[PDB]
Design an enzyme around this catalytic site. Structure first.
Site, PDB file in Angstrom:
ATOM      1  N   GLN A 166      34.038  39.780  29.581  1.00  0.00           N
ATOM      2  CA  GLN A 166      34.059  39.394  30.981  1.00  0.00           C
ATOM      3  C   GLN A 166      34.807  38.067  31.181  1.00  0.00           C
ATOM      4  OE1 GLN A 166      30.330  38.613  33.020  1.00  0.00           O
ATOM      5  NE2 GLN A 166      31.041  39.638  34.897  1.00  0.00           N
ATOM      6  N   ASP A 187      38.533  38.878  30.769  1.00  0.00           N
ATOM      7  CA  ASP A 187      38.896  39.633  31.936  1.00  0.00           C
ATOM      8  C   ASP A 187      39.138  38.774  33.163  1.00  0.00           C
ATOM      9  OD1 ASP A 187      38.063  40.739  34.538  1.00  0.00           O
ATOM     10  OD2 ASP A 187      38.404  42.564  33.383  1.00  0.00           O
ATOM     11  N   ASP A 226      39.954  35.717  33.144  1.00  0.00           N
ATOM     12  CA  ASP A 226      41.079  34.844  32.901  1.00  0.00           C
ATOM     13  C   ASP A 226      42.335  35.617  33.288  1.00  0.00           C
ATOM     14  OD1 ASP A 226      43.260  33.403  31.394  1.00  0.00           O
ATOM     15  OD2 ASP A 226      41.591  32.252  30.605  1.00  0.00           O
ATOM     16  N   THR A 248      46.368  33.850  37.048  1.00  0.00           N
ATOM     17  CA  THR A 248      47.539  33.971  36.193  1.00  0.00           C
ATOM     18  C   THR A 248      47.383  35.056  35.113  1.00  0.00           C
ATOM     19  OG1 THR A 248      46.894  32.258  34.574  1.00  0.00           O
ATOM     20  CG2 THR A 248      47.910  31.505  36.588  1.00  0.00           C
ATOM     21  N   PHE A 264      48.585  35.111  32.117  1.00  0.00           N
ATOM     22  CA  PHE A 264      48.524  34.563  30.757  1.00  0.00           C
ATOM     23  C   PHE A 264      47.105  34.187  30.376  1.00  0.00           C
ATOM     24  CE2 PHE A 264      52.390  33.076  32.925  1.00  0.00           C
ATOM     25  CZ  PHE A 264      53.338  33.792  32.234  1.00  0.00           C
ATOM     26  N   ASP A 311      45.270  31.690  29.581  1.00  0.00           N
ATOM     27  CA  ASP A 311      45.466  30.248  29.593  1.00  0.00           C
ATOM     28  C   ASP A 311      44.290  29.416  30.078  1.00  0.00           C
ATOM     29  OD1 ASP A 311      45.433  30.972  32.180  1.00  0.00           O
ATOM     30  OD2 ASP A 311      47.501  30.505  32.661  1.00  0.00           O
ATOM     31  N   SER A 330      42.668  29.817  32.820  1.00  0.00           N
ATOM     32  CA  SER A 330      42.756  29.575  34.251  1.00  0.00           C
ATOM     33  C   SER A 330      41.362  29.733  34.882  1.00  0.00           C
ATOM     34  CB  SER A 330      43.741  30.545  34.897  1.00  0.00           C
ATOM     35  OG  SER A 330      43.329  31.879  34.708  1.00  0.00           O
ATOM     36  N   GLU A 356      28.446  35.027  39.163  1.00  0.00           N
ATOM     37  CA  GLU A 356      28.045  36.454  39.344  1.00  0.00           C
ATOM     38  C   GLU A 356      26.799  36.793  38.554  1.00  0.00           C
ATOM     39  OE1 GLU A 356      28.720  39.168  36.884  1.00  0.00           O
ATOM     40  OE2 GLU A 356      28.019  40.814  38.175  1.00  0.00           O
ATOM     41  N   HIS A 411      31.623  47.393  31.613  1.00  0.00           N
ATOM     42  CA  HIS A 411      30.493  47.668  32.487  1.00  0.00           C
ATOM     43  C   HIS A 411      29.466  48.561  31.806  1.00  0.00           C
ATOM     44  CE1 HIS A 411      32.898  46.653  36.408  1.00  0.00           C
ATOM     45  NE2 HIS A 411      32.479  45.577  35.760  1.00  0.00           N
TER      46      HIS A 411
HETATM   47  C1  HEM Z   1      26.478  41.905  34.092  1.00  0.00           C
HETATM   48  C2  HEM Z   1      27.801  41.724  33.885  1.00  0.00           C
HETATM   49  C3  HEM Z   1      28.862  42.154  34.925  1.00  0.00           C
HETATM   50  C4  HEM Z   1      28.751  42.206  36.260  1.00  0.00           C
HETATM   51  C5  HEM Z   1      27.515  41.799  37.097  1.00  0.00           C
HETATM   52  C6  HEM Z   1      30.024  42.642  36.812  1.00  0.00           C
HETATM   53  C7  HEM Z   1      30.324  42.809  38.147  1.00  0.00           C
HETATM   54  C8  HEM Z   1      31.579  43.104  38.668  1.00  0.00           C
HETATM   55  C9  HEM Z   1      31.974  43.295  40.071  1.00  0.00           C
HETATM   56  C10 HEM Z   1      31.095  43.271  41.349  1.00  0.00           C
HETATM   57  C11 HEM Z   1      33.285  43.578  40.086  1.00  0.00           C
HETATM   58  C12 HEM Z   1      34.152  43.894  41.342  1.00  0.00           C
HETATM   59  C13 HEM Z   1      34.240  45.400  41.554  1.00  0.00           C
HETATM   60  C14 HEM Z   1      35.179  45.781  42.675  1.00  0.00           C
HETATM   61  O1  HEM Z   1      34.954  45.330  43.839  1.00  0.00           O
HETATM   62  O2  HEM Z   1      36.171  46.548  42.432  1.00  0.00           O
HETATM   63  C15 HEM Z   1      33.762  43.571  38.718  1.00  0.00           C
HETATM   64  C16 HEM Z   1      35.067  43.785  38.341  1.00  0.00           C
HETATM   65  C17 HEM Z   1      35.584  43.750  37.069  1.00  0.00           C
HETATM   66  N1  HEM Z   1      34.846  43.733  35.891  1.00  0.00           N
HETATM   67 FE1  HEM Z   1      32.806  43.460  35.839  1.00  0.00          FE
HETATM   68  N2  HEM Z   1      30.893  42.885  35.758  1.00  0.00           N
HETATM   69  C18 HEM Z   1      30.209  42.589  34.575  1.00  0.00           C
HETATM   70  C19 HEM Z   1      30.693  42.650  33.292  1.00  0.00           C
HETATM   71  C20 HEM Z   1      31.974  42.901  32.901  1.00  0.00           C
HETATM   72  C21 HEM Z   1      32.443  43.076  31.534  1.00  0.00           C
HETATM   73  C22 HEM Z   1      31.591  42.774  30.278  1.00  0.00           C
HETATM   74  C23 HEM Z   1      33.765  43.265  31.596  1.00  0.00           C
HETATM   75  C24 HEM Z   1      34.806  43.466  30.460  1.00  0.00           C
HETATM   76  C25 HEM Z   1      34.482  43.670  29.190  1.00  0.00           C
HETATM   77  C26 HEM Z   1      34.117  43.376  32.982  1.00  0.00           C
HETATM   78  C27 HEM Z   1      35.348  43.678  33.468  1.00  0.00           C
HETATM   79  C28 HEM Z   1      35.695  43.725  34.808  1.00  0.00           C
HETATM   80  C29 HEM Z   1      37.058  43.782  35.256  1.00  0.00           C
HETATM   81  C30 HEM Z   1      38.299  43.801  34.350  1.00  0.00           C
HETATM   82  C31 HEM Z   1      37.010  43.776  36.765  1.00  0.00           C
HETATM   83  C32 HEM Z   1      38.222  43.834  37.739  1.00  0.00           C
HETATM   84  C33 HEM Z   1      38.558  42.425  38.221  1.00  0.00           C
HETATM   85  C34 HEM Z   1      39.847  42.386  39.022  1.00  0.00           C
HETATM   86  O3  HEM Z   1      40.956  42.580  38.438  1.00  0.00           O
HETATM   87  O4  HEM Z   1      39.783  42.164  40.265  1.00  0.00           O
HETATM   88  N3  HEM Z   1      33.025  43.142  33.763  1.00  0.00           N
HETATM   89  N4  HEM Z   1      32.709  43.278  37.875  1.00  0.00           N
HETATM   90 CA   LIG Z   2      44.966  33.397  33.229  1.00  0.00          CA
END
Ligand code: HEM
Ligand SMILES: [Ca+2]
Ligand SMILES: *[C@@H]1O[C@H](CO)[C@@H](O[C@@H]2O[C@H](CO)[C@@H](O[C@H]3O[C@H](CO)[C@@H](O)[C@H](O)[C@@H]3O)[C@H](O)[C@H]2NC(C)=O)[C@H](O)[C@H]1NC(C)=O
Ligand SMILES: *[C@@H]1O[C@H](CO)[C@@H](O[C@@H]2O[C@H](CO)[C@@H](O[C@H]3O[C@H](CO)[C@@H](O)[C@H](O)[C@@H]3O)[C@H](O)[C@H]2NC(C)=O)[C@H](O)[C@H]1NC(C)=O
Ligand SMILES: *[C@@H]1O[C@H](CO)[C@@H](O[C@@H]2O[C@H](CO)[C@@H](O[C@H]3O[C@H](CO)[C@@H](O)[C@H](O)[C@@H]3O)[C@H](O)[C@H]2NC(C)=O)[C@H](O)[C@H]1NC(C)=O
Ligand SMILES: *[C@@H]1O[C@H](CO)[C@@H](O[C@@H]2O[C@H](CO)[C@@H](O)[C@H](O)[C@H]2NC(C)=O)[C@H](O)[C@H]1NC(C)=O
Length: 595
Positions: A105, A108, A110, A184, A186, A188, A190, A258, A351
């Site tokens: 997370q 991600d 970053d 960003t 990268f 980095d 951020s 969050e 997730h």
């Molecule tokens: C309890 C832990 C976590 C919670 C409460 C959570 C919650 C959320 C929420 C609400 C979103 C926005 C969904 C949307 O509106 O489309 C999101 C997006 C995302 N989550 Fe999770 N998440 C968790 C853990 C993780 C984990 C462990 C990862 C990766 C291993 C992850 C990767 C992502 C990614 C890549 C996004 C998209 C962000 C973007 O590009 O805008 N999340 N998460």
């Molecule tokens: Ca970054």
């Protein structure tokens, strides 16, 4: 094609070209094309977008329209039938710690963030979406299916607002709709420093020439700092406990609070920056604040990249690691470092790794108090359990001694996230992350499962029988087609995560490819990649190979017992050593002499 120079990012930046530091926005990384990888630009498209009207209308919007001849199933129905499960027994990953989930997370955040839309400083459609479930403009509600328990208790839908998009903010025309990446591309750090001038400067302690990040002035953790409070009302963190009055933290990234464990790592990273800066001031008394900041910051970026590529990616991708990410051969200015749209869904495999509870352990790694283990849903936007209930040490020990949830075809997303999610804008612990992920795939114009199987050079199931063999599960394949009617319509998120995991890894063939090529690109397309000659000196990189997350804990918390390999499952006390046995970062290589 359509315009090649469209956009609405941070407007007035120009490059130094000989500066040894990254810009905050990401600009100037690529000398030939400066905006490449910069924040507030469009997410890249590895494949053309798929919309109902070919431009911006998501599939699922118009009931009468089909996708390849069929109706797309409701996000919540897919969630109810494929994603949910009741029994949490037996779901833990026997060889991955809770930190495995948590670092994902961090990485991600970053890399990507596609914020939801707004044009409502005092909106009332904001209420038309919630109260009435009326679809229109940026409101694209998740409707509940026949026989959903939430019907009886929550209404007819969950509100859901479409992701922001480039060029404008207005309805529009022009090219197919592209969503924005507000951070960003990268790796980095951020998420610690910010991606905008504006925010990066507000996080700094400019009251003293020591290059420190501002810390909280109201609360302390045994003499150790916390992030400033985000003193903007109304606060989500205050709302969950009207009585504690504890606001959310302020960090380089807006999602920092969050969940409690996320807020925890953000705190360690902030603490590490300041530790840095102090150490560099003892070594180089003549350095000004700007240099202390940038040098500490540069170091923090390298730690994040190293922990990520050395310890974390190998155990996600497993046997597929070397297939997609070969040994570093240097910077390639021809590589596109942008995060692609599909990656922001592929990286959501995490997730399915989130367990139902979070524990606090004391110094002997035994339950901390009478309410040591808590349900995940009560920890969303919960900062009061940290300030008023033990500090971060008990949480840190949990991250080390507890396990992540294992992705399981029959048990995919815990009910803590699937039925009880709390969204910062609304007031109920009643949302569904899974349904949101599915709705978002459509909002972002994602091609279907088979389009990506092809992209990755993998077979495309055309029949139930074919999908069975790919998923290696008769029952899952069947429910999936009973809902989608053709493998071509399966949303990338659910399809990617339904595949069996590759050897020694935690994601399937498809996700391994999408994840793998994206990570290869941000590393090879980064001019400031830590291993690129000239970024750091040889002696500086020798110091930099000795990092570890375990030691980050030792220098920024009072946890004195940590494991040597923090990402795998570790049992106390057998696998825990004293901090004295873990390598430190030698910073003498950063000692500068004037004459
Ligand atoms: C309890 C832990 C976590 C919670 C409460 C959570 C919650 C959320 C929420 C609400 C979103 C926005 C969904 C949307 O509106 O489309 C999101 C997006 C995302 N989550 Fe999770 N998440 C968790 C853990 C993780 C984990 C462990 C990862 C990766 C291993 C992850 C990767 C992502 C990614 C890549 C996004 C998209 C962000 C973007 O590009 O805008 N999340 N998460
Ligand atoms: Ca970054
Ligand atoms: C739990 O996961 C562990 C890591 O995924 C795993 O041990 C790791 O196994 C790999 C090979 O599969 C080895 O990786 C590297 O380590 C050796 C050190 O002896 C190096 O010489 C080689 O370069 C090699 O590539 C490690 O031995 C180890 N990795 C780490 C970081 O410790 C365990 O086997 C898993 N436990 C169970 C019960 O399955
Ligand atoms: C920005 O950096 C400032 C300089 O390091 C920092 O000032 C320091 O603030 C702490 C507490 O906020 C002071 O610590 C002192 O705390 C008790 C008061 O209860 C004193 O009795 C002790 O002497 C102890 O040192 C530091 O004295 C103070 N340092 C200096 C040189 O003034 C600011 O707090 C930072 N500002 C932000 C927003 O983070
Ligand atoms: C909202 O946050 C409150 C904390 O800011 C929290 O109350 C606190 O939690 C418990 C009571 O539930 C108390 O802990 C123990 O305190 C002493 C030990 O030092 C004992 O003698 C008490 O019996 C108690 O068990 C805290 O003192 C208490 N603080 C206050 C001011 O009440 C609430 O529980 C939170 N409410 C919700 C709904 O989350
Ligand atoms: C930098 O990466 C680029 C882009 O991947 C490589 O250039 C070419 O890329 C195309 C597309 O895959 C292929 O034809 C070859 O990989 C490359 N073409 C040729 C004729 O070699 C390139 O390999 C990399 N450049 C350096 C200097 O490593």
């Amino acid at each position: 094609s359509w315009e090649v120079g469209c956009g609405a990012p941070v407007p007035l930046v120009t490059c130094d070209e000989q500066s040894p530091y990254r810009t905050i926005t990401g600009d100037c990384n690529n000398r030939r094309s400066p905006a490449l990888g910069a924040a507030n630009r469009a997410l890249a498209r590895w494949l053309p977008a798929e919309y109902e009207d070919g431009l911006a209308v998501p599939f699922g919007w118009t009931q009468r329209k089909t996708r390849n001849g069929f109706r797309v199933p409701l996000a919540r129905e897919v969630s109810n039938k494929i994603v949910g499960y009741l029994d949490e027994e037996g779901v833990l990953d026997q060889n991955r710690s809770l930190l495995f989930m948590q670092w994902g997370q961090i990485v991600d955040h970053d890399l990507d963030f596609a914020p939801e839309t707004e044009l409502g400083s005092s909106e009332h459609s904001k209420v038309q979406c919630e109260e009435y479930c009326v679809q229109g403009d940026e409101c694209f509600p998740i409707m509940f299916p026949k026989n959903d328990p939430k019907l009886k208790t929550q209404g007819k839908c969950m509100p859901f607002f479409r992701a922001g998009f480039v060029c404008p903010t207005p309805p529009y025309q022009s090219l197919a709709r592209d969503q924005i990446n507000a951070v960003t591309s990268f790796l980095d750090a951020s998420l610690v420093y910010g991606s905008e001038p504006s925010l990066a400067s507000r996080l700094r302690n400019l009251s003293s020439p020591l290059g420190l990040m501002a810390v909280n002035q109201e609360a302390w953790d045994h003499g150790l700092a916390y992030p400033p409070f985000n003193n903007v009302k109304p606060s989500p963190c205050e709302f969950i406990n009207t009585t504690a009055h504890v606001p959310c933290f302020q960090a380089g990234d807006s999602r920092a609070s969050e969940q409690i464990l996320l807020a925890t790592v953000h705190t360690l990273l902030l603490r590490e920056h300041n530790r840095l800066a102090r150490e560099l001031k003892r070594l180089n008394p003549h350095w000004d604040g700007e240099m202390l900041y940038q040098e500490a910051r540069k170091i923090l970026g390298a730690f994040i990249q190293i922990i990520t590529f050395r310890d974390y990616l190998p155990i996600v991708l497993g046997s597929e690691m070397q297939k997609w990410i070969p040994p570093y051969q240097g910077y390639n200015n021809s590589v596109d470092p942008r995060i692609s749209n599909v990656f922001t869904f592929a990286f959501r495999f995490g997730h399915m790794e989130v367990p139902s509870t979070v524990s606090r352990l004391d110094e002997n790694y035994q339950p901390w108090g009478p309410e040591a283990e808590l349900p995940l849903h009560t920890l969303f936007f919960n900062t009061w359990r940290i300030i008023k209930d033990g500090g971060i040490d008990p949480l840190v020990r949990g991250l080390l001694a507890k396990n992540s949830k294992l992705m399981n075809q029959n048990k995919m997303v815990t009910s803590e996230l699937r039925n009880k999610l709390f969204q910062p804008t609304h007031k109920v612990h009643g949302f569904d992350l899974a349904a949101i992920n599915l709705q978002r795939c459509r909002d972002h114009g994602m091609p279907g499962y088979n389009s990506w199987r092809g992209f990755c050079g993998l077979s495309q199931p055309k029949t139930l029988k074919g999908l069975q063999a790919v998923l290696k599960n008769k029952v899952l394949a069947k429910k999936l087609l009973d809902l989608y009617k053709t493998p071509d319509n399966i949303d990338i998120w659910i399809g990617g995560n339904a595949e069996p995991m590759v050897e020694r890894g935690r994601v399937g063939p498809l996700l391994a490819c999408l994840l793998g090529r994206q990570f290869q690109q941000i590393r090879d397309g980064d001019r400031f990649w830590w291993e690129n000659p000239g970024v750091f000196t040889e002696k500086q990189r020798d110091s930099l190979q000795k990092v570890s997350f375990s030691r980050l804990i030792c220098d920024n918390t009072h946890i004195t017992k940590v494991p040597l390999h923090a990402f795998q499952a570790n049992n106390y006390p057998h696998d825990f050593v004293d901090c004295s046995a873990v390598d430190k970062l030698d910073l003498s290589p950063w000692a500068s002499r004037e004459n």
